[PDB]
Ligand binder design. Structure first.
Ligand SMILES: [Cl-]
Length: 293
């Protein structure tokens, strides 16, 4: 069965005066592979994928600020806050050239960093990633009223902050197979106190949907314009029915994006890592062996 443990040695680095936790396994040299999680996860989401890559490549998986085992400063946890901390995390580790493996809000971080620093990105593997959702009709109908409610300071904070709905409900509605109690306890651990749930609420309020927020829509449009032209090697994982990326969106991206290979993982919603980790890990490792890294 799918692994529930998190065996990785903890590593911590000071970033802008705060401690960030990260996984760091595999060989010390070579080009490192940087894994970026999203909402409401942590490096735990990569726990069954990294073991396929670590035999041949260094794997670095940070917990975003305010998440996982990273510190919890009193921030708004806007996307811009995550950009500042992730930019500084990369520099604090002395990383030069990297391969990115990115998902959900980790994909917005990774694509935005890659567009700004294309000389340092030797490949991008991505899945269920952030793109502009032009209208609410392009958000999945089964989740539409709830994401609209999440994007308010009254109803949305009651759901996400007071009642932890992004962890207890949305997370499960983002995985096809059932999560176990042990897995749920790993996902719950950073958010036992309601006040620590700010990033879980700010993230859906940053999603670029129906033109709002305009600043995020613009930033995401910019990195998508880059991705449609850049020769950077690309590996796209997708599932059915998906959430952010429906199968039809995925198949077209695969042929439109330069130097891109697409991989169908089977049934999947948002956290594709929880539905088919072994295929995602083995395909990343195979694809890495084809790169000039
Ligand atoms: Cl979100």
């Amino acid at each position: 069965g799918i692994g529930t443990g998190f065996p990785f040695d903890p590593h911590y680095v000071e970033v802008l005066g705060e401690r960030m936790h990260y996984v760091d396994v595999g060989p010390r040299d070579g080009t490192p592979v940087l894994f970026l999680h999203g909402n409401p996860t942590s490096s735990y989401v990569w726990r069954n994928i990294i073991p396929h890559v670590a035999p041949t490549h260094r794997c670095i998986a940070p917990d975003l600020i305010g998440m996982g085992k990273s510190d919890k400063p009193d921030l708004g946890y806007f996307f811009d806050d995550h950009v500042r901390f992730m930019d500084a995390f990369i520099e604090a580790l002395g990383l030069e050239e990297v391969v990115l493996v990115i998902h959900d809000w980790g994909s917005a971080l990774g694509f935005h960093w890659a567009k700004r620093n294309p000389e340092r990105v030797k490949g991008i593997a991505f899945m269920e990633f952030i793109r502009p959702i032009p209208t609410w009709d392009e958000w999945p109908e089964f989740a539409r009223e709830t994401f609209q409610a999440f994007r308010t300071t009254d109803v949305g904070r009651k759901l996400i902050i007071d009642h932890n709905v992004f962890i207890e409900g949305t997370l499960l509605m983002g995985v096809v197979r059932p999560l176990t109690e042990v897995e749920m306890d790993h996902y719950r651990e950073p958010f036992l106190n309601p006040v620590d749930r700010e990033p879980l609420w700010r993230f859906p309020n940053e999603l670029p949907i129906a033109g709002e927020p305009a600043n995020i829509v613009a930033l995401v449009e910019e990195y998508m314009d880059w991705l449609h032209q850049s020769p950077v090697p690309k590996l796209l994982f997708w599932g059915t029915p998906g959430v952010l990326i429906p199968p039809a969106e995925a198949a077209r991206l695969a042929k439109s994006l330069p130097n891109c290979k697409a991989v169908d993982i089977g049934p999947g919603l948002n956290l594709l890592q929880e539905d088919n980790p072994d295929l995602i890990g083995s395909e990343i490792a195979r694809w890495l062996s084809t790169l000039e890294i």
